[PDB]
Design a protein that fits this description.
The structure is cut from a larger assembly and holds chains A (about 50 residues), B (about 120 residues), C (about 200 residues), D (about 120 residues) and E (about 200 residues).
Chain A (H helix, E strand, L loop, with lengths): L5 H12 L6 H6 L21
Chain B lengths: L4 H4 L4 H23 L5 H32 L16 H4 L4 H5 L3 H9 L9
Helix pairs in contact in B: 2-3
Chain D lengths: L32 H4 E4 L3 H10 L1 E6 L5 H11 L4 E8 L5 E7 L5 H7 L4
Classes of the chains: A mainly alpha (about 50), B mainly alpha (about 120), C alpha+beta (about 200), D alpha+beta (about 120), E alpha+beta (about 200).
The structure holds potassium ion (2 copies), magnesium ion (MG) (13 copies) and sodium ion (NA) (2 copies).
Chain E binds two RNA strands through helix 4 and helix 7.
PDB class: ribosome
Keywords: Giardia lamblia, Ribosome structure, Translation, parasite, ribosome
Entry title: 60S subunit of the Giardia lamblia 80S ribosome
RNA sequence: CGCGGCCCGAGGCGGCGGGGGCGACGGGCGGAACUUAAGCAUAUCAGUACGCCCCGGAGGAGAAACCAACCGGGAUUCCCCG
RNA sequence: GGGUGAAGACCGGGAAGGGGCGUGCCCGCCCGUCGAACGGGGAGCCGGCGGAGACUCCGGCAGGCGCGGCCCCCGCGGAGA
């Protein structure tokens, strides 16, 4: 909604900042086999419950 | 790189305070440089050193202050709870060793007239 | 207007106190308890308190001075000439009972307001059976002040100096006149109607 | 007695007088002026702000309020401040719009700090 | 001999004098709270017999409890199982009223150590007891060899583990010999020892 | 009508304590039914599951208001035996 | 405050239950800064600007509520409304 508490707003803020891929220089520095971050979410499919 | 606490322990409180002020000011300057333009290697190199320099100066100041305050309450009955000896809760709430060895007077008298002796059989 | 004081709602403690006084006043109290409701007169009590004040034990400030002076002098030497044998009165129910049963006490004073009362409920009959004069008196505080304690259950005379003998004999005669045992043991108390008085 | 109600009497009340201090050493917090300010924001809209309205856009600590942002800006950059507007962004940072006093050229201060 | 006289006196509860005193006391207690601190013991001789001393660290509390049997806690008074478990109102508590008073006081004052208790009065809907408690951190208590043992951490909440005299009696520990061989060191311990399946290496 | 002692209470201050956590072992309470009886109601499962409270490195118990019946033993605990 | 229950907990007006001015006196039986982005509530309009914001930015013109200085007064008219 457009009328939220700051407490709910801060927990949703962290979810957005975390929805990122694995950086390219990290994949090769650590010699990673699996190159996708499976803790990502999509707004049309998820239920954050926050 | 950076300062050493060795030669830092040789300054007065005011000097350290001024040093800290300058370090924080130029840390803000480096943050501005990172936020704008681009991260050239030299300023980014200086950045980490400055952060750890602030850490070191704060360490020295706090150690000096703690030593002074601890010397202020050396012989008092009640001292701040931050200077009392480090123990656990359970061993803090416990009887000392002599309190455990106390006996009533009658038992003291009895246990003195029959002391332990060394002997062998055969 | 009119006075509002007799209409105040007092705190629970005060009300309990006053109701307890009333109840003790208008119930049927047995004669053994009743004897502690009928103390000795005030004049004789004053005479006895004067005589007893002449025989008081050590004073608290004198005690404090002694605790240093005589304590450190007993180390020097001459210990026997350090605790004078000044005649004093005795306090405490245990000691009083001990010397009443051996007939070393001439006069026994018992406070009228001991709580609980079983502590001294039997003492008058023991004294009577032992042939020892006794008197009930007004307050534990006064008996305590005699011996420099907050309060005490009773004191007793064990000896008196030759000079004070005549006054002691007068006091004894007055006490023997003013205290009767059989009448006290036959008389009930309480039973006062509210409307009557 | 003009009131029929019994009230608790008035007794002397004392003040606290601890035998030992509860916080022997005075410690700092987050609110130091230089650490309160984080960094300026650099975009074309913001340079247009500097040129047109005499305003600078800065990132600050979320716990800061308008009066202390004004004081910190005045002390760290020697200048005068007219008004401050604030904002908390969707990612959780605090943004301040600082408009300088009319007799102050915001552009020269911006350039001196290196923002220009 | 004063305390001998007091003891013999307290053996005659039905005399007129003691009857009058008991009536006064029972009226007095009925106007107070269910848990209350006392300035001093009401019965000095019994308190001395149970271990009380007149020094800093000993305290006395008066406790009130209700009389009669117990009623089960089940909605609408319905038990649902087999017919032998169907009773509601005719039951009796497994512990005595003297042992319940110590539990109530221990719950109310968790920072003190319970010692003992004794009877002081009853009136037909209540009984009153007195409980002796010790402050384990007072220096006079901690430096006295005669009471030091209660400063140990194993003396914490003795009444909650059935270790006082009344709890011990409810556990069956006032008996020895024939009739008492299946209840030491505790009922469950004896049951466990008598039903263990020992499987040795060379069976 | 005022003020001293004792007694019973009230408000504040100082210094020390308490509270909560821990799928085992330990102590104290409350307390089933499935199941077996070839049905089932006493009995059994079981003084178990589970609920509540409380310690410790162990806990609990413990120096006879005991066994026994003998040419007797002798605080408590744990193992073997029936 | 308390009451009850083995507890967990649940129930509750009969209880010495606060302030002011300013240091002494005076007044006074007894909870809640819990519960409504629709109920009550002191006060905002116009024009313009961006790529994504506007009763919030800028320009103009106003309102309400406080604080600080300087001057600065303790009521008259009508037959009556
Ligand atoms: K069973
Ligand atoms: K609202
Ligand atoms: Mg800090
Ligand atoms: Mg034991
Ligand atoms: Mg306190
Ligand atoms: Mg089964
Ligand atoms: Mg069957
Ligand atoms: Mg079958
Ligand atoms: Mg069937
Ligand atoms: Mg069985
Ligand atoms: Mg043990
Ligand atoms: Mg509200
Ligand atoms: Mg509205
Ligand atoms: Mg406006
Ligand atoms: Mg829009
Ligand atoms: Na607990
Ligand atoms: Na432990």
């Amino acid at each position: 909604s457009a009328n939220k508490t700051l407490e709910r707003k801060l927990r949703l803020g962290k979810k957005i900042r975390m929805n990122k891929n694995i950086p390219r220089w990290v994949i090769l520095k650590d010699k990673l086999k699996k190159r996708w971050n499976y803790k990502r979410h999509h707004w049309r499919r998820s239920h954050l419950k926050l | 790189p950076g300062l050493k606490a060795k030669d830092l322990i040789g300054l007065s409180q005011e000097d350290l305070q001024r040093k800290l002020a300058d370090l924080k000011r130029e840390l803000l300057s480096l943050r501005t440089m990172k936020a704008t333009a681009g991260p050239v290697p030299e300023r980014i190199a200086r950045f980490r050193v400055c952060k750890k320099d602030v850490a070191r100066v704060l360490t020295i100041i706090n150690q000096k202050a703690r030593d002074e305050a601890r010397a202020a309450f050396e012989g008092a009955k009640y001292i701040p709870k931050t200077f009392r000896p480090k123990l656990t809760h359970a061993m803090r709430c416990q009887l000392t060793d002599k309190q455990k060895r106390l006996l009533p007077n009658k038992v003291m008298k009895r246990k003195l007239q029959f002391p332990k002796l060394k002997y062998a059989v055969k | 207007d009119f006075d509002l004081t007799p209409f105040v709602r007092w705190p629970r403690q005060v009300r309990i106190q006053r109701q307890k006084a009333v109840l003790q006043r208008r119930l049927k109290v047995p004669p053994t308890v009743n004897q502690f409701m009928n103390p000795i007169s005030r004049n004789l009590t004053n005479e006895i308190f004067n005589l007893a004040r002449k025989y008081s034990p050590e004073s608290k400030e004198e005690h404090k001075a002694r605790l240093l002076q005589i304590a450190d002098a007993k180390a020097n030497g001459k210990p026997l000439p350090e605790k004078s044998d000044k005649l004093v009165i005795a306090s405490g129910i245990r000691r009083i009972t001990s010397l009443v049963e051996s007939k070393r006490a001439k006069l026994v004073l018992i406070a009228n307001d001991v709580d609980p009362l079983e502590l001294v409920l039997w003492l008058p009959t023991l004294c009577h059976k032992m042939g020892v004069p006794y008197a009930i008196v007004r307050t534990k505080g006064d008996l305590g002040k005699l011996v420099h304690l907050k309060k005490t259950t009773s004191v007793c005379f064990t000896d008196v100096n030759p000079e004070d003998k005549p006054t002691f004999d007068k006091i004894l005669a007055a006490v023997a006149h003013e205290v009767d045992y059989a009448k006290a043991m036959k008389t009930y108390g309480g039973g006062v109607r509210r409307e009557d008085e | 007695r003009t009131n029929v109600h019994f009230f608790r009497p008035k007794t002397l009340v004392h003040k606290k007088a601890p035998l030992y201090p509860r916080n022997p050493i005075k410690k700092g917090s987050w609110d130091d002026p230089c650490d309160l300010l984080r960094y300026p924001i650099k975009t074309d809209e913001n340079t247009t702000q500097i040129e047109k309205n005499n305003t600078i856009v800065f990132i600050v600590d979320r716990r800061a309020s308008k009066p202390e942002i004004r004081k910190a800006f005045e002390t760290v950059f020697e200048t005068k401040v007219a008004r401050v507007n604030t904002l908390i962004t969707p990612l959780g940072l605090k943004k301040a719009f600082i408009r300088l006093a009319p007799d102050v050229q915001a552009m020269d201060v911006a350039s001196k700090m290196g923002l220009a | 001999g004063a305390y001998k006289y007091v003891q013999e006196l307290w053996r005659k509860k039905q005399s007129e004098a003691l009857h009058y005193l008991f009536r006064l006391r029972t009226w007095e207690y009925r106007q107070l709270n269910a848990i209350k601190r006392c300035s001093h013991p009401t019965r000095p001789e019994k308190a001395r017999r149970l271990g009380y001393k007149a020094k800093r660290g000993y305290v006395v509390y008066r406790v009130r409890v209700r009389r009669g049997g117990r009623k089960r806690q089940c909605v609408h008074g319905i038990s649902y199982g087999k017919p032998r478990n169907i009773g509601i109102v005719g039951l009796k508590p497994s512990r005595s009223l003297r042992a319940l008073a110590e539990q109530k006081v221990g719950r109310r004052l968790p920072s003190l150590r319970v010692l003992n208790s004794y009877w002081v009065a009853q009136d037909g809907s209540y009984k009153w007891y007195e409980v002796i408690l010790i402050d384990p951190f007072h220096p006079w208590i901690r430096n006295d060899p005669k009471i030091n043992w209660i400063c140990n951490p194993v003396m914490k909440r003795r009444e909650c583990r059935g270790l006082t005299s009344a709890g011990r009696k409810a556990r069956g520990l006032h008996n020895k010999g024939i009739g008492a061989m299946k209840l030491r060191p505790s009922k469950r311990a004896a049951w466990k020892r008598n039903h263990t399946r020992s499987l040795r290496r060379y069976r």
